[PDB]
Design a protein around this ligand. Structure first.
Ligand SMILES: *C(=N)[C@H](C[C@@H]1CCNC1=O)NC(=O)[C@H](CC(C)C)NC(=O)c1ccc(-c2cccc3nn(C)cc23)cc1
Ligand SMILES: *C(=N)[C@H](C[C@@H]1CCNC1=O)NC(=O)[C@H](CC(C)C)NC(=O)c1ccc(-c2cccc3nn(C)cc23)cc1
Lengths: 304, 304
């Protein structure tokens, strides 16, 4: 028993991290087969990052201007091309540790594990949710760019995120593995603002199910509600709309705990208009919206 | 920037996890060199676990009664011996993925990463602090036994914990890699109580430094205090004594942020007798004592 923020085992992704150095800028790359992926601002100086022309910068670079290193061995760059905000370097050697992988573009509200790397070497792992405003609340220092977010399906590593930027508010923004940013952000050292953020309602209800599973039950009331009456109450507190697709995802969790989905909604409706009144849920004085329904089942059933 | 609960990269430990099956009980083992380590209650039935005689049970077992499997290959057990609460099986093959490792017995207040495994395969990773009452607040299902806690020093994996038990209160208890339990617990399905727990004061002050590092500063006052005057206030709130060794560990953190250690103590003294008054620190309405000083420096300097 017990409930914790849990990240995927990072072993498979660790064997793919390489260091990329162009001139003086150094960051991390993703080495799958004989192609290395990294943010395209590897080729910028400190002074180009405030308004760069990545097409111009990439012209003046030959294959030899890029220094890819896996461990204490160098990998020879044979070609290079840019796909949106991601650079792609073809190397003369395919990674013998390459796992079965996929390139997915995740949706807001979904979670993933972040392997924070520096100089092509891992430093830690944690879990992040893609906010409704297409940001993530991560923990990245200088040189962390190139670190990847991922999910694991049995044996297939699903890469979904690559770190690029930190916003003035402290949150972070990045792209998928095709160079396409999440949200209306650009890779440029300039002031940018994210949209106003909302609370992921489904993740809150799933967190309440993990609460009931682990014995926290003081918030369950005898009432039920309809889906529409819950939405009109939840929105004045800036909670995301609950749709029928959402109730359907919460289905199996509602079956394991015996609590109807709309009964848990009536409990959340009471939580928002009454507060917690000095009590905590899962040792937390605040509600939590960074646990998807799939995350809860994984921790409470052991997917492995 | 940003601050998150961060676990070590679990790649090295992943290559050491094997499945151990004795008769019908199945759990996880630690395969380093040609020796596999696992909890000794692998040899119990469901009915023996309420008051087992592990010496008696181990007699009636030959080398062949143990089924060690790494992936889809079987490892042949050549010898077996028990060291306290840990079983040791000698196999005819040494793990080619064996890392540089050490067996350490950590102190209360220190943290480590937990690789939760089932059927010899990893399912997730998270960070845990060894409580002052020698328990840990983990997340373990049935069959998780044999999962190990560890810390990584550059290239050396320091194993310090092996999961054994869940207490009636939901917390968890285990041993080091020599079979020696942390605290006054025994491997037996019977009601046991841990000592009354306390708040790790040093970890709280280090968490406040990470707060200041990341811009959270509303709690810093203009006052200072002496170490003894802080301890007399902190203890009525069940906070651990702050000793000179403790101020010395917080030293380098106090140097990076420019705040004297005893100035941060005067701020914590004000926090305990006045509360937070509706404000949060690091997005948390509660104080946090599961971040050691070393954890904070790692996340705010990138040890890698
Ligand atoms: C990648 N190596 C690095 C990681 C990033 C920087 C350190 N922490 C992080 O999360 N990414 C960058 O350095 C990136 C490079 C560009 C994409 C070319 N730049 C930024 O992440 C960045 C953008 C914008 C600002 C910025 C601008 C105006 C005002 C302002 N106020 N704050 C606070 C930040 C501001 C800073 C950094
Ligand atoms: C290891 N495979 C397993 C993991 C453990 C069980 C599931 N979640 C966990 O954390 N460990 C065991 O099954 C272990 C085996 C013994 C060491 C032989 N037993 C327990 O972990 C355990 C001990 C005691 C109790 C128990 C006893 C009396 C009252 C009571 N009230 N609650 C709540 C638990 C109680 C249960 C389980």
């Amino acid at each position: 028993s017990g409930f914790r923020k849990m990240a995927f085992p990072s072993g498979k992704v660790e064997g793919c991290m390489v260091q990329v150095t162009c001139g003086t800028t150094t960051l991390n790359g993703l080495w799958l087969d004989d192609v290395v992926y990294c943010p395209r601002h590897v080729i910028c100086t400190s002074e180009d990052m405030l308004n760069p022309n990545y097409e111009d910068l990439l012209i003046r670079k030959s294959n030899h201007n890029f220094l890819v290193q896996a461990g204490n061995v160098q990998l020879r760059v044979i070609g290079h091309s840019m796909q949106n905000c991601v650079l792609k370097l073809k190397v003369d050697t395919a990674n013998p540790k390459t796992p079965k992988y996929k390139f997915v573009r995740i949706q807001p509200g979904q979670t993933f594990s972040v392997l924070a790397c520096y100089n092509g070497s891992p430093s830690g792992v944690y879990q992040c949710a893609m906010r409704p405003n297409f940001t993530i609340k991560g923990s990245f220092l200088n040189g962390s760019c190139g670190s990847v977010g991922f999910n694991i399906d049995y044996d297939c590593v699903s890469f979904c995120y690559m770190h690029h930027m930190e916003l003035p508010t402290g949150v972070h923004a990045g792209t998928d593995l095709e160079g396409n940013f999440y949200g209306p952000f650009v890779d440029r050292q300039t002031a940018q603002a994210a949209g106003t953020d909302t609370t992921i309602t489904v993740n809150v209800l799933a967190w309440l199910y993990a609460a009931v599973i682990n014995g926290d039950r003081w918030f369950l009331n005898r009432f039920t509600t309809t889906l529409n009456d819950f939405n009109l109450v939840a929105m004045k507190y800036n909670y995301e709309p609950l749709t029928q697709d959402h109730v359907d995802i919460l289905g199996p969790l509602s079956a394991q705990t015996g609590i109807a989905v709309l009964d848990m909604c009536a409990s959340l409706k009471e939580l928002l208009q009454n507060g917690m009144n000095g009590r905590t849920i899962l040792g937390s004085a605040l509600l939590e919206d960074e646990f998807t329904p799939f995350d809860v089942v994984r921790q409470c059933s052991g997917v492995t």
